[PDB]
Design a protein around this ligand. Structure first.
Ligand SMILES: [Cu+2]
Ligand SMILES: [Cu+2]
Ligand SMILES: [Cu+2]
Ligand SMILES: [Cu+2]
Ligand SMILES: [Cu+2]
Ligand SMILES: [Cu+2]
Ligand SMILES: [Cu+2]
Ligand SMILES: [Cu+2]
Ligand SMILES: [Cu+2]
Lengths: 298, 298, 298
């Protein structure tokens, strides 16, 4: 796209504020930002807020979101679809033109770990170029295992293809498949989907802890066989809904856009890889590390 | 196949009649019929009754089916395998020669949304050329959410490949991935697997309704990440068995031949896309629309 | 690999002995062994004990395993990762050099049907060359349906690619997808992953029996849509954990490394194919047979 040549819009923080006991304002951008998805490989991504996947959004069950998208792309329209919400797609996930803003309001009445993404046709093109992310909706009565959990993180799996190549998006194998982590609390890492950062800077934990991961595989195209090496998931809540309870899973199957809450114990010090067990994808990037130390610090 | 050149056998209605409180006769054909699977693209499909996927069959839990296949293909044998039934495959899903009929009897003792398909070797070839469909077996005690449901439809996902090309069937990406709808009640649409009909003629619903979809992904080869844009599934019954209950799913993972009953609320007027969230497949056809109006009519 | 030219190390039996009420010794080899994966097609596999998938391991919930790997490969390191165990991957699933042995100890505290595999980088390469298998951990209180089960077998699904070809492993479709059976009791078959043995020598059962299969899809790369023709699964326990109970499934979706216990009734004499319903994979080998006779014998 000629109007994207040389464009690299610096990342802009997510803006979010609570405006009532059940109402929350969120402001995001759509912007074009260079991201290093593998060493030496820059992808001029289509993004929310200069991150791909985009920034994490966390709301409470029953919150209505009053969402604004500011479209900083000079030529391509963008839009936002949160899988958390009940909305009219043709009214509420509509396009925002370049250099304009649009505001939409919709409720999040279901707990869980939901994908969000751009909804502009062709949606494959907008998702594959980087316009995906996760919104977590926290359950009003929590999860039955909340009191067991010592530490938590968010992980997202996505693919990257040949740059803005619709033939490859529809017909080709992914060039890279990658994990990123998005921060829940100050001091947590906040990374983009790349083949290396969570290997070189593992997530941290302490010996004996029960870890909860909020996970989503945003695709665009693959499913995920999510596994933490050296442990078994004690409890799994499919899509993060507390009712969809499984126990003792070695691997969690996630559809494209599928989410889960998974919990597992790390019994011994060491580094624990986190993979999709579709090992062609692991080989193409989708391995993150969890470093477990006697103190929980590096 | 030289004997299929120029053959286009007009569709023949499904014949079905109840012959006892727990016994039902069904008569289907195997026939060769041109179907427009994308605009300008005709596939000379191998079909049941001139439809691909084939006609919907609905029976009650505990019904024994006395099934007749009339093979109208001039040269290729065909057969029928219902995933609903308990049967001896080597006795009861055997081949019926060209211009012959065969009758088989077997019970449907499990509720759910089951694939049926031709079972003639190579089964990949017979399924990929179009010989797939769905049989629904209604549960004797219903589903716990029956009283919440306002409106229901049947959707089936399938792929189409290069015509009768066994190399492509085994080794190639699908050319098209498509939804069709099969009628439950008079006035419901009854369509074939194509990239366009359920976009141009959306399924209809009314604002505020709880919709139930009986879904199956018949493949042949892909899995499906089934999602309705702008809602969340309130309840999901995997394979349509009432015991396999999930709640609050954003997306339902279906294996090849996998079925489900899914239910969800449409809160606002508008058009709601229905996709597999494997977006390479959505892009290649697998998007249907649900138009939600204040009255439920167009 | 020049040092593998002409190498064909005869299979070595698994050695296992109980050394306390909750402790079990296991000794395996890593060795390079020719296996006929399709008629006329020899794959010089990387294996445990000269079998691919490797030998079956069965322990009880709560057993600690004291595992020794003897590496008979003349040049490549190997290692062992059991998905059953809680262990430190960087201490306990480490490499054993050629012509050396290594011993690791770790507990199996979760019931189910777990994949095991070599954990040496690149793990895709070691899994795809044949270093995968299953460990079953039997639940302390059994499964609720144990008393209904007449006969049981173990089935494993895997893929084979072009020989030791990392490009094909990461980017190519599988050349073959295959089932094997591993013996639970004397007289049960014990086979390797090939396109033909369980067609030519079906598993046996008797009319009217309830069959339990312990299944795992070890990949490396594909997911599996597991189906037995002519029946419906009465009960399914995902990953073999008794709590993850489903009923009346036509097809069980397994992630890569995913396991299950499935149970189903065979009502009539005949031969019952067992497939992944991803029919491109079935066509490339993944069909096993179950021959059901009036006596249970051939
Ligand atoms: Cu507001
Ligand atoms: Cu966009
Ligand atoms: Cu593993
Ligand atoms: Cu009759
Ligand atoms: Cu046929
Ligand atoms: Cu979506
Ligand atoms: Cu010992
Ligand atoms: Cu190895
Ligand atoms: Cu089938």
């Amino acid at each position: 796209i000629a109007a994207h040549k040389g464009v690299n819009q610096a990342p802009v923080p997510l803006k979010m504020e609570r405006v009532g006991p059940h109402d929350v304002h969120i402001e995001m951008t759509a912007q074009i930002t260079d991201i290093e998805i593998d060493k030496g490989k820059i992808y001029k991504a289509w993004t929310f807020n200069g991150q791909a996947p985009g920034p994490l959004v966390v709301v409470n069950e029953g919150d209505t979101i009053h969402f604004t998208l500011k479209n900083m792309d000079p030529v391509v329209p963008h839009s936002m679809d949160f899988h958390a919400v009940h909305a009219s797609p043709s009214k509420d996930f509509i396009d925002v033109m370049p250099n304009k803003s649009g505001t939409f309001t919709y409720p999040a009445n279901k707990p869980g770990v939901f994908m969000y993404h751009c909804g502009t046709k062709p949606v494959l093109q907008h998702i594959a170029n980087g316009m995906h992310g996760v919104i977590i909706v926290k359950p009003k009565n929590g999860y039955p295992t909340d009191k067991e959990v010592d530490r938590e993180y968010v992980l997202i799996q996505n693919e990257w293809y040949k740059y803005n190549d619709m033939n490859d998006f529809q017909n080709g194998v992914p060039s890279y498949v990658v994990f990123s982590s998005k921060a829940l609390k100050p001091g947590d890492p906040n990374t983009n989907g790349d083949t290396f950062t969570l290997k070189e800077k593992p997530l941290l934990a302490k010996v004996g802890e029960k870890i909860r991961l909020y996970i989503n595989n945003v695709g665009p195209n693959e499913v995920s066989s999510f596994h933490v090496v050296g442990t078994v998931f004690d409890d799994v809540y499919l899509d993060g809904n507390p009712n969809n309870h499984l126990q003792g899973m070695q691997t969690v199957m996630l559809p494209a856009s599928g989410g889960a809450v998974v919990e597992f114990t790390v019994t011994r010090p060491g580094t624990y890889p986190i993979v999709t067990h579709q090992f062609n994808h692991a080989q193409k990037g989708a391995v993150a590390m969890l470093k477990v130390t006697e103190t929980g610090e590096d």
